[PDB]
Amino acid sequence: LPLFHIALLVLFMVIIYAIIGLELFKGKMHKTCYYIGTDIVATVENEK
Amino acid sequence: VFTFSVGQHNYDRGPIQWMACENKGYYYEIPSIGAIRINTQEYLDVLG
Amino acid sequence: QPKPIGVGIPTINLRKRRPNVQNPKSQEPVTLDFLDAELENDIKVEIRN
Amino acid sequence: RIKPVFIDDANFRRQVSYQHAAVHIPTDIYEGSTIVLNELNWTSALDDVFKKNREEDPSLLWQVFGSATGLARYYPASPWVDNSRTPNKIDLYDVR
Amino acid sequence: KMTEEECRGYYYVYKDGDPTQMELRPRQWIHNDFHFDNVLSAMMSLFT
Ligand SMILES: *[C@@H]1O[C@H](CO)[C@@H](O[C@@H]2O[C@H](CO)[C@@H](O[C@@H]3O[C@H](CO)[C@@H](O)[C@H](O)[C@@H]3O)[C@H](O)[C@H]2NC(C)=O)[C@H](O)[C@H]1NC(C)=O
Numbered sequence: 001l002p003l004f005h006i007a008l009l010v011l012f013m014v015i016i017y018a019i020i021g022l023e024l025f026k027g028k029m030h031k032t033c034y035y036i037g038t039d040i041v042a043t044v045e046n047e048k
Numbered sequence: 049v050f051t052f053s054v055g056q057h058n059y060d061r062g063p064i065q066w067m068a069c070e071n072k073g074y075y076y077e078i079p080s081i082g083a084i085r086i087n088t089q090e091y092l093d094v095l096g
Numbered sequence: 097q098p099k100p101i102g103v104g105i106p107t108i109n110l111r112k113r114r115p116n117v118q119n120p121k122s123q124e125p126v127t128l129d130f131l132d133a134e135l136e137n138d139i140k141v142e143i144r145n
Numbered sequence: 146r147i148k149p150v151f152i153d154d155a156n157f158r159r160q161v162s163y164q165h166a167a168v169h170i171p172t173d174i175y176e177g178s179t180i181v182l183n184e185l186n187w188t189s190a191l192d193d194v195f196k197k198n199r200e201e202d203p204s205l206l207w208q209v210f211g212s213a214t215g216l217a218r219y220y221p222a223s224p225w226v227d228n229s230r231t232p233n234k235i236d237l238y239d240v241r
Numbered sequence: 242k243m244t245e246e247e248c249r250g251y252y253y254v255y256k257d258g259d260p261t262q263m264e265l266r267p268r269q270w271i272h273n274d275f276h277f278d279n280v281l282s283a284m285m286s287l288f289t
Pocket residue numbers: 186187188189190
């Protein structure tokens with residue numbers, strides 16, 4: 001029960017940061033380098 | 049009867065080995081793509 | 097002819113082909129029937145048999 | 146290893162050497178194993194019969210021993226069409 | 242290849258799991274970065 005205020009603060013911070021990220025990085029991580037003319041993502045041995 | 053155990057799994061492989069070397073056959077294991085070519089051509093040794 | 101025997105209709109998916117893979121070419125034999133090398137005829141079938 | 150001369154020949158649209166036989170080993174089969182080295186040890190006696198057959202009938206084309214261990218010894222010696230990784234292309238040839 | 246003497250030569254690597262997309266890599270007997278060979282390496286592994 002005493003952790004109620006902390007949980008409220010956590011939810012409040014999470015909501016604020018979610019909205020900030022929504023307005024800052026919306027639809028930005030949608031371009032990656034494919035190969036020439038193909039639908040294959042180009043990476044190296046140990047890179048995601 | 050030639051039996052092939054394909055893939056990586058935790059299932060029992062005893063019965064298929066019994067089927068293999070009960071009906072004058074052979075038992076093979078194919079865990080990956082690299083073993084397919086070698087293990088799909090060895091049955092000609094038993095037939096010879 | 098030295099060309100390999102064709103089967104079906106060739107379909108390719110150029111969007112899933114890396115440029116540095118060396119895909120396998122062919123290993124099949126050139127097996128052309130007598131009736132597929134000339135115009136098939138009823139007498140020709142009898143002669144072939 | 147051996148460095149042949151590889152003269153140009155007729156009836157072979159390639160460069161061939163009649164002094165010995167060439168050996169093809171699949172790329173994913175490591176040469177230098179006990180199994181492979183033993184095969185190369187006793188298959189070296191086929192070159193004399195290869196030469197005898199060629200001299201008896203000069204119109205002979207490739208004559209090859211396809212080993213059950215993956216090796217392929219053929220006469221006359223001639224470079225393979227597809228090197229392992231010298232070009233950007235590789236080969237997938239198992240005599241079996 | 243289960244042994245150091247077997248882990249020699251070259252082998253095929255199939256990227257994206259396609260059997261038709263091949264690449265050649267040399268076979269090398271690798272050793273894990275964190276191991277338990279001696280007490281010092283074991284202590285480093287347990288600290289990690
Ligand atoms: C496979 O490799 C072995 C080893 O290199 C070959 O055996 C070798 O054969 C030669 C020909 O006979 C031997 O030379 C002879 O040695 C005796 C003494 O042992 C000598 O008195 C003769 O005058 C002659 O020089 C050689 O010693 C022998 N090597 C060994 C280690 O025994 C064998 O020929 C190879 N297989 C094939 C099919 O060629």
